[PDB]
């Protein structure tokens with residue numbers, strides 16, 4: 001039935017600024033929080049302020065030199081780190097900004113704290129909209145991500161769970177998470193993403209893992225314009241087959257909202273209901289679940305999406321009419337929660353969707 005939900009948020013998160021022209025806006029996390037507060041969703045959740053994850057907690061995955069660099073670099077001393085900046089991929093996508101390290105500490109803190117709460121059996125679901133930064137690598141920042149809070153949260157879950165399932169519905173391939181666990185069968189990574197002339201360039205349907213991890217990485221490559229009908233047609237069947245074969249004891253779901261229609265960087269056509277149907281599908285399996293954020297660059301739609309997904313986690317129905325809130329004007333001209341899909345062509349034909357699903361089903365038959 002209805003589950004206990006723990007939500008992680010730090011009121012300072014919205015003040016971190018990647019810089020003029022950068023599409024990543026931490027302010028969208030504050031818009032989400034304010035909208036969900038004005039809908040009354042705080043009365044049903046346990047709200048926690050995450051601790052600032054230590055450099056030591058981060059080195060459970062990342063290299064000591066990379067974390068030392070992140071903790072040392074600032075806009076005022078950047079000139080002395082031009083060598084390490086190239087080495088760790090700090091530049092246009094992953095710039096040096098005021099409070100960069102503290103932003104990583106809060107993003108990571110929420111994910112690891114949520115994983116600890118799930119491990120202690122003190123909650124059914126844990127939510128950290130500031131997390132989900134799936135591109136960060138062991139010793140390299142990538143695609144607006146510096147510390148891989150997801151990998152750290154999964155390593156925490158692995159202390160009490162033999163098998164953990166990771167599902168990623170961001171429009172971009174979950175490469176950092178897939179790479180971290182590519183050679184192990186203790187984590188199965190499943191990513192649905194746009195593939196073809198698109199960042200990060202990985203996630204081919206033929207990338208299925210290696211060594212003991214062979215068949216434990218699943219990639220569903222998609223073309224522009226996928227809609228609710230098409231996404232829904234493959235998501236539940238694939239996740240059901242993965243649950244059946246893999247039998248995970250905990251799940252981590254990255255809810256990147258850049259897969260929504262009208263995203264500034266994305267080219268998909270999902271509505272908030274279509275995106276949230278993924279949360280409903282996963283929630284139905286009644287397993288300990290960590291829900292994380294990720295991409296999302298049309299910030300009014302990211303706030304709508306994550307507010308609705310928090311309501312889904314709580315089994316709470318909320319009206320389409322938006323309540324008054326601190327950012328009300330951002331939701332014009334309609335001031336409604338739900339969004340309409342665009343007229344863009346769906347390049348993912350029904351036959352293509354079925355064919356890719358059948359190839360993934362063949363790989364899933366190879367599990368023990």
Ligand SMILES: CCC(O)(O)CCCCC[C@H](NC(=O)C1CN(C)C1)c1[nH]c(-c2ccccc2)nc1C(N)=O
Pocket residue numbers: 021022023092093132133134135143144145170172199256258265294295296
């Ligand atoms: C948080 C998780 C997430 O998956 O959502 C992150 C998405 C990251 C997208 C990064 C992308 N970067 C690239 O395409 C650059 C081109 N190569 C040098 C790499 C990129 N960078 C930028 C960018 C634009 C303006 C200023 C800075 C970066 N746009 C894009 C783009 N349209 O794909």
Ligand SMILES: [Ca+2]
Pocket residue numbers: 168169170171172173174191192193
């Ligand atoms: Ca993905």
Ligand SMILES: [Ca+2]
Pocket residue numbers: 181182183184185186187188189209213216217
């Ligand atoms: Ca794996």
Ligand SMILES: [Zn+2]
Pocket residue numbers: 170171172256258294295296
């Ligand atoms: Zn993305």
